[PDB]
Symmetry: C3
Subunit: 328 residues, 3 copies
């Protein structure tokens, strides 16, 4: 088969691809370097992170159903921990987890057949308590396996997006001093026991998009134009989420994220199960600011799960109009 | 278009309406007054509440798909906070949030087109941390946008309800003294910091139907007759719920709440995503008491999420019979 | 109608049955003894348990749609509490709860018609705060009501399983000393107040399959062969779960668990609503170890929600291959 080498792009963006496969099956070649580093989650909150390719989430991979995926995974010598990868897209050996365990200083190449269309989580899963710990330290991303003929709606009609944004949502469990301020450590291992204690409460200290509070707001805000069909691919490798586009809807939504299932329509809020990726298509109809949020609003605002979308275009009074301005 | 002025009715009831639109599109006129007040949630538990029209949830609005909605929203001078409204039913300006911010002493009129059929949350969302806070202080309701030709099942057959009940479920975060008793404040602002601390744990002190523990039990119990088709419209603006009619089922269920999607059938328990409204139709077959509950039973019983339904009619031994009474 | 007496088998196994009903409607006779006993959840963690037939979950019952179910329920004199049973499969009297309350020393026989196909929770529900308490002390199981003609897919095609495994997931709330170690009591009543306090946080101390941490790992691991179609019936009577077969998928999934609804396909992770049972069919394609987990990985690993499946057969390099072994 033809081989195709991809240059991955950081989230929320996506590497160059075509929705309708331009060729028959190919072998898709990707490479990622595991990067262990402390990352700033919020003003005075840091995580001893473990990442695929330096980002949280790991970068989005896009292939077509029936293609193969060959991932070269590298664990540089500066790292402290063994690591591996579990593709929920894959069949066998714990999603690849059982064939990809690498020590600092090693690399591995895994091939699998992308036999099933949909957005899928990939995540580290070295074994035992290392499994949740590596995930909640940021070690998860997404691979999107498109049907060879592109997306289809609930009636089998072809549908197309102008833009895909990959929204990786991640729950983190940063230990706190008695006064509520966050603790700092020299490395992930030093912080492990105190993190486990937070993990055991099941209460995230932070729940973020693109690896930090406000990553996708301000200068990081998503951009679109009236008329654009935007696919929002949303992963959550460990905990549930309930995405909502404030001022919009999900025109077509695969909340369980598998493209041969019929999508639901007109959703206000949908549901990403912890350990999965879903996808929602919306055509923007109005200009202005939108917020894309986890609609546990405490999770959205206090914990960090809020992105903004800035949309340019012409306002439509038929859809909405302020008939009487605030007055009194 | 014709204009129609509605008199809203408190939950769990619904204002006068027809399921199959009697006319072509109309402009529906509603008015609500924001009422800030301390409300009793339980025997020794009070909330500094912020309400639409004095109730938790805010009252149910019912219109048809393609109609317009013109809401006059009033923030009386006795109130302390600015407020607004986000209709998840609406397209643009943060659901109307960006066009409806009003100070105490002001009123505003918003128009929007109800372009999408389904039950939708409406909720206050003034901006930033005010957003979760106003919601968890009780500031949310529901608008139900019926298809012009009424409800249809999974096969496109017309279906009809005898009764709609609006069940508004709300999670609250009342601060506690060390001994577990609940704190009281002079106004919402005074209580804000202590409430944020509870909010951050993500653990509600109370989860209630119709604004208080036992609101829909005892004298508040819902009523029906064997043979009645009852639509249970269930909102939860901030947190997930898993509704269950004890002794019954969901005959037709739109758990994501959007009527053009095919409903599921025969459900024991369904799922309302935080930030959404769903709807379930059941035809009562047996008389007696039923409980309608969030089936996290701790949430149902300890937190307050239990309603009762008292059903009159004739018992059917073919469905169930006590063959041998307790004996020994 | 013919009467059929069943010998129940402990979970995760299932009593002898046929998927396509061999006869027209029958009356299915089951008997269960309530057993109150302290059970070991983990190395140094015990629960004052209340069980159907001595197991957590209670044993799986399997009947066909249109059959009757006659359960003889026995509360031996050594027990301390009244008990009853609520079949979510049943119509009327709080699922049978209102016809089955029995004191220690009593027995009762309930008949109901299994009018609806699907997997359903059954659980104790004596009344008031006894309801969540008996459930979280282990008092819940499942009845699976198969369509008379067996399972059908999203296109109405007959499908068949080789093996059903009943995975009962249960959240428990064991009180802790200040140092984080677990408390022991002489009986359930002695432990009640301290358990309520844990219940109120909504944070389980343990979340287990088949009644204990590691029940379904090690010697308890599930077994299958490449090619086997295994139905995983998954109940959670009180709290949500998000099941995942590591290294596999859900080929056909009824996450809300009602068989006349079309299943979704190719799922990575699905969702069991608290208070329900769902079911997922998978055909094993690769040999080796799999883990079946709640994909809140903290819940899976720290809390106990992990089962293993050991699969024998021939490896398929087309699906997955380690192209370059760890090297460096
Ligand atoms: Cu790792
Ligand atoms: Cu996984
Ligand atoms: Cu407000
Ligand atoms: Cu909203
Ligand atoms: Cu009991
Ligand atoms: Cu129940
Ligand atoms: Mg690179
Ligand atoms: Mg400090
Ligand atoms: Mg469209
Ligand atoms: Mg009025
Ligand atoms: Mg006090
Ligand atoms: Mg019917
Ligand atoms: Mg026996
Ligand atoms: Mg101790
Ligand atoms: Mg198949």
């Amino acid at each position: 088969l033809p081989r195709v080498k991809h240059t991955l792009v950081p989230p929320p963006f996506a590497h160059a691809h075509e929705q309708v496969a331009a060729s028959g099956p190919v072998i898709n070649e990707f490479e990622m370097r595991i990067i262990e580093k402390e990352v700033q989650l919020d003003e005075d909150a840091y995580l001893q992170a473990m990442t695929f390719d330096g980002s949280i989430p790991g970068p989005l991979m896009i292939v077509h159903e029936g293609d193969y995926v060959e991932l070269t995974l590298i664990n540089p010598p500066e790292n402290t921990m063994p690591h591996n990868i579990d593709f929920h897209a894959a069949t066998g050996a714990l999603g690849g987890g059982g064939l990809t365990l690498i020590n600092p200083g090693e690399k591995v190449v895994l091939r699998f057949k992308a036999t099933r269309a949909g957005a899928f989580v990939y995540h580290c899963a070295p074994g035992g308590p290392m499994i949740p710990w590596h995930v909640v330290s940021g070690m998860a991303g997404c691979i999107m396996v498109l049907p060879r003929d592109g997306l289809k709606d609930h009636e089998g009609k072809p549908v197309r997006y102008d833009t895909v944004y990959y929204i990786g949502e991640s729950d983190h469990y940063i230990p706190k001093d008695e006064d509520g301020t966050y603790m700092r450590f020299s490395d992930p291992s030093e912080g492990y026991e105190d993190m486990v204690a937070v993990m055991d409460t099941l209460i995230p200290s932070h729940i973020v998009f693109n690896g930090a509070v406000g990553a996708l707001t301000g200068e990081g805000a998503l951009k679109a134009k009236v008329g654009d069909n935007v696919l929002f691919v949303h992963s959550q490798p460990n905990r549930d989420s309930r995405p909502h586009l404030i001022g919009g809807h999900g025109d077509l939504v695969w909340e369980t994220g598998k493209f041969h299932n019929a999508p639901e329509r007109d959703l206000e809020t949908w549901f990403i199960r912890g350990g999965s990726a879903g996808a929602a298509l919306y055509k923007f109809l109005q200009p202005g600011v939108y917020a894309y949020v986890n609609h546990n609003l405490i999770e959205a605002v206090h914990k960090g799960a809020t992105a903004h979308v800035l949309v340019e275009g012409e306002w439509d009074n038929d859809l909405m109009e302020q008939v009487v301005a605030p007055v009194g």
